[PDB]
C-alpha cells in the first residue's frame, strides 16, 4: 500500500530549570525508528527498529549532528518567539515541527509536509505546492518573510521530492518483513449487562497494524454514529494497536446490531454480531 516517513520535533522551555528540552522521533508509517533526547545522559540519535541498526557509523554521526543543531536553533527560536508575541521570559513555551513525505504503492511522491506550531497552535506551514507558506498570524508572517527571502521552500521541496522519498524507499526494502506487512485486527463482540433494560455491546479490534482502522455499529443497517462510544486507537506495546466501539442496546434487541470493521489487512470488510 501507501507509506509515509515523518520526523517530529518538540522543544519545551523551562525558565529557571536549564535550557529547553528537545525531543525528536522519526517514523515510517506507525513504526518508530529513530529518537534523540537532549536530556539523555549522552545525547545521540538512537535506533529503535532492527532494520535501521544496519546503517553504519557515518549515518548515526550525520543524524546526531542534525538533531543537535535543530535543538540549538529551536532554543534561539524560542527566544525569538518571545519577542514576536511580546511575552515574558518567565513562562514555559513549546515549539513543535513535523516534516516528511507520503508515497503511493509505486513509491511516487503523493505529497510532502513541513509545518510548525507554537504553544500548541498552528504557526507556519509549507503549502501542498511545496512552494508557498500559510502563516497563522502576524508573528508567523515575520518568519514567512524571512523564509521567502531565503527561498527556504525550494530547499524543502528538493529534499521532500528527492532524499525523503529515496530513503523511505530504502527503509521499506530493508524493513520489508515488518514495514510491508499489514496485520489484520482480531475481532469479537462482548456483552456487558447494565441493567435489566440495557446492555453494552462492545466491538473489539486487537493486534492490528497499521493504526488506521474503521469500526462502526449499525442498528437495522443504519449507522449509529451519534450513539457509539469510540475510544481512541491505542498502542499495545508490541507494535500493534487496539480499538473498540460500544453501543447501549435494549435487552433482547442485540441481534439488530452489527459491527463493521475496515482495515487494510482485511481483503473485504468484516461484519460481526454478538454470539451468545
Amino acid at each position: 500500500g501507501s507509506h509515509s516517513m515523518r520526523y517530529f520535533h518538540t522543544s519545551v522551555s523551562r525558565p529557571g530549570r536549564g535550557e529547553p528540552r528537545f525531543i525528536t522521533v522519526g517514523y515510517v508509517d506507525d513504526t518508530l525508528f529513530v529518537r534523540f533526547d537532549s536530556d539523555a545522559a549522552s545525547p545521540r540519535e538512537e535506533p529503535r527498529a532492527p532494520w535501521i541498526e544496519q546503517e553504519g557509523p557515518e549515518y548515526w554521526d550525520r543524524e546526531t549532528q542534525i538533531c543537535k543543531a535543530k535543538a540549538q536553533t529551536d532554543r534561539e527560536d524560542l527566544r525569538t518567539l518571545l519577542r514576536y508575541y511580546n511575552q515574558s521570559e518567565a513562562g514555559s513555551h513549546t515549539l513543535q515541527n513535523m516534516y516528511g513525505c507520503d508515497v503511493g504503492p509505486d513509491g511516487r511522491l503523493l505529497r510532502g509536509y513541513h509545518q510548525d506550531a507554537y504553544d500548541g497552535k498552528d504557526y507556519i506551514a509549507l503549502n501542498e505546492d511545496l512552494s508557498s507558506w500559510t502563516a497563522a498570524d502576524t508573528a508567523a508572517q515575520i518568519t514567512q518573510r524571512k523564509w521567502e527571502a531565503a527561498r527556504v521552500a525550494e530547499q524543502l521541496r528538493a529534499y521532500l521530492e528527492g532524499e525523503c522519498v529515496e530513503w523511505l524507499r530504502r527503509y521499506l526494502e530493508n524493513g520489508k518483513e515488518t514495514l510491508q506487512r499489514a496485520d489484520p485486527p482480531k475481532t469479537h463482540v462482548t456483552h456487558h449487562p447494565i441493567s435489566d433494560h440495557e446492555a453494552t455491546l462492545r466491538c473489539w479490534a486487537l493486534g492490528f497494524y497499521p493504526a488506521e482502522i474503521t469500526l462502526t455499529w449499525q442498528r437495522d443497517g443504519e449507522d449509529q454514529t451519534q450513539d457509539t462510544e469510540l475510544v481512541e486507537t491505542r498502542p499495545a506495546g508490541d507494535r500493534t494497536f487496539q480499538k473498540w466501539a460500544a453501543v447501549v442496546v435494549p435487552s433482547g434487541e442485540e441481534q439488530r446490531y452489527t459491527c463493521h470493521v475496515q482495515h487494510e489487512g482485511l481483503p473485504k470488510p468484516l461484519t460481526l454480531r454478538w454470539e451468545p
Binding site: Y7, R62, I66, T73, L81, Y99, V152
Partner: peptide, 10 residues
C-alpha cells in the same frame, strides 16, 4: 534520513 538543513531560524 533527516533534512540536513532542517535547523531553520524562525
Amino acid at each position: 534520513r533527516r533534512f540536513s538543513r532542517s535547523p531553520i531560524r524562525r
